[PDB]
Amino acid sequence: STGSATTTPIDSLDDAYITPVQIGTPAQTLNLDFDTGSSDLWVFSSETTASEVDGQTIYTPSKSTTAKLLSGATWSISYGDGSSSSGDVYTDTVSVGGLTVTGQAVESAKKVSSSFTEDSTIDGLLGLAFSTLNTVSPTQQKTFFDNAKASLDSPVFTADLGYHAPGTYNFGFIDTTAYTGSITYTAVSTKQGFWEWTSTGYAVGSGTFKSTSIDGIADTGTTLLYLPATVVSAYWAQVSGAKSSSSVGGYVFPCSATLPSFTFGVGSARIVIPGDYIDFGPISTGSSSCFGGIQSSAGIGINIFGDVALKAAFVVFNGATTPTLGFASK
């Protein structure tokens, strides 16, 4: 089997991407944030505290003839941005782009933190990291991909995120028309439960490539590119007037600037992030200070190849017995 679904930016900045997901019988379609940095499929629901729902579409398990309470199971997750959610668990039929999993754990939120409430466009998350990170207790549950894997034509999924445009998540096949050149594959460590890999270096604009190992995670659920402070300083030094602002919480730059590209290495291959991809717009409405899309990972404890980086590539999440990652230009 295969599946193919379009993923759409939630706003004009590509702050996140939503993908429609069918849950239950008859189908209830929710727009979920596919997150290769976590491993829980959780949704706003009829159980979510009413004051914490503000425009999201909710899953109502009592209206699904295939929903079953997973007795005794609870979940609770905290994300790197400080947001969180928790609740109980049903199993139900879940379909993505024509690919169907029966008995998928659907984690129903009883509580969500303010940032989830405040984002009316995201109805929940669909985790695509390794199932060892799933938070369900006392019986850990599998991700959608883990449950589908054996049925897929090939044990892979691909992320093809757009810049200011829709893109595609495919399951079970590699669309050879969706990228240019060849796909370069690179080793993955699953020791932390992430799609963790080592970039071979970087370049800023037209500058020379610096060969240096950068361990980080391919994380579709993180908006920006978080890299070591040395690398990030080297990038922003090429932008007149750019500075790190403690009060804003990262590097800012004059909105009048033209930003240089940023290249990262994948083995001997190179992925070029155009400068425009690194502009996240005014820090507040009407400001001429703009927020940068490359930020320091110092204090986060891990480097994160988030959407800024991934959207410049066609990315293969290869879930073979020994997982690997593939990157192609597009």
Swiss-Prot record:
Its EC number is 3.4.23.22. GO terms for molecular function: aspartic-type endopeptidase activity. The active site is at D35, S199. Residues 17-328 form the Peptidase A1 domain. GO terms for biological process: proteolysis. Keywords: Aspartyl protease, Disulfide bond, Hydrolase, Protease, Signal, Zymogen. Disulfide bonds join C255-C290. The keyword Protease applies. It comes from the Eukaryota. It catalyses: Hydrolysis of proteins with specificity similar to that of pepsin A, prefers hydrophobic residues at P1 and P1', but does not cleave 14-Ala-|-Leu-15 in the B chain of insulin or Z-Glu-Tyr. Clots milk. Belongs to the peptidase A1 family. This is Endothiapepsin. The gene is EAPA.
